[PDB]
Curated annotation (Swiss-Prot), chain A:
Organism: Mus musculus (Mouse)
Biological role stated in the UniProt entry: Transcriptional repressor which may act as a negative-feedback regulator of CLOCK-BMAL1 transcriptional activity in the circadian-clock mechanism. May stimulate BMAL1-dependent phosphorylation of CLOCK. However, the physiological relevance of these observations is unsure, since experiments in knockout mice showed that CIPC is not critially required for basic circadian clock.
Subcellular location field: Nucleus; Cytoplasm, Cytosol
Taxonomic superkingdom: Eukaryota
Residues of the full protein shown: 352 to 413 of 432
Expressing tissues: Expressed in the heart, kidney and liver and shows a circadian oscillation in these tissues with a peak at circadian time 14 hours (at protein level). Expressed in the brain, including the suprachiasmatic nucleus (SCN) of the brain, and in multiple peripheral tissues such as heart, liver and kidney. Exhibits a circadian oscillation in the peripheral tissues with a peak at circadian time 14 hours.
Annotated coiled-coil segments of the chain: 13-44
Knockout mutant characteristics: No visible phenotype. Knockout mice display normal locomotor activity rhythms and normal behavioral responses to light. Animals show reduction liver PER1 peak levels, but no change in the expression of other core clock genes.
The protein, known as: CLOCK-interacting pacemaker
From Swiss-Prot, chain B:
Segments for region (Implicated in the circadian rhythmicity): 1-42
Organism of origin: Mus musculus (Mouse)
Induction: In the SCN, nuclear expression is lowest between CT7 and CT13. Cytoplasmic expression is highest at these times. In liver, peak levels from CT21 to CT3. Expression of both phosphorylated and unphosphorylated forms of BMAL1 with other circadian clock proteins occurs between CT15 and CT18. Expression in the heart oscillates in a circadian manner.
Record comment regarding domains: Contains a Gln-rich C-terminal domain which could correspond to the transactivation domain.
Subcellular location per the Swiss-Prot or TrEMBL entry: Nucleus; Cytoplasm; Cytoplasm, Cytosol
Tissue: Expressed equally in brain, eye, testes, ovaries, liver, heart, lung, kidney. In the brain, expression is abundant in the suprachiasmatic nuclei (SCN), in the pyriform cortex, and in the hippocampus. Low expression throughout the rest of the brain. Expression does not appear to undergo circadian oscillations.
Subunit (UniProt): Component of the circadian clock oscillator which includes the CRY proteins, CLOCK or NPAS2, BMAL1 or BMAL2, CSNK1D and/or CSNK1E, TIMELESS and the PER proteins. Forms a heterodimer with BMAL1. The CLOCK-BMAL1 heterodimer is required for E-box-dependent transactivation, for CLOCK nuclear translocation and degradation, and for phosphorylation of both CLOCK and BMAL1. Interacts with NR3C1 in a ligand-dependent fashion. Interacts with ESR1 and estrogen stimulates this interaction. Interacts with the complex p35/CDK5. Interacts with RELA/p65. Interacts with KAT2B, CREBBP and EP300.
UniProt protein name: Circadian locomoter output cycles protein kaput
Amino acid sequence: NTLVVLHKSGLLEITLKTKELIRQNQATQAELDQLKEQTQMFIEATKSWAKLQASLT
Amino acid sequence: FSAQLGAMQHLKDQLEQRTRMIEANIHRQQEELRKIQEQLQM
Amino acid sequence: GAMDPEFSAQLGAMQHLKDQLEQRTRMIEANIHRQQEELRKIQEQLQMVH
């Protein structure tokens, strides 16, 4: 009856909330990584460029 | 050259807008985190 | 051994899981702080553009 004890203890609910928060936070890290690369590309461009064209196509 | 400044400023403004969107998502995550931590201090 | 074996093991398993969850929230908390600093850095770089 481990699933029952997990539920009645409150830890089922908390574990589920924590897994969803981890998912969200990993999604946000992927968004940040892409934004980092786009920013760096944009800054590089202002100081060279057609490297923008590849992205903006 | 005014035209170029406005184009790059349009790019800059969209990237800045992205930072603000991501910031709001993290603020919401921080509030969910606080609630989980409170439940873990049963 | 009055205590039922499954009951005793479930007790230790839930305490362990609680500890793991507390640690995972600490990890999330630290990542959020790092991601905030990364957004700060991106904002600082963008303001250098004209």
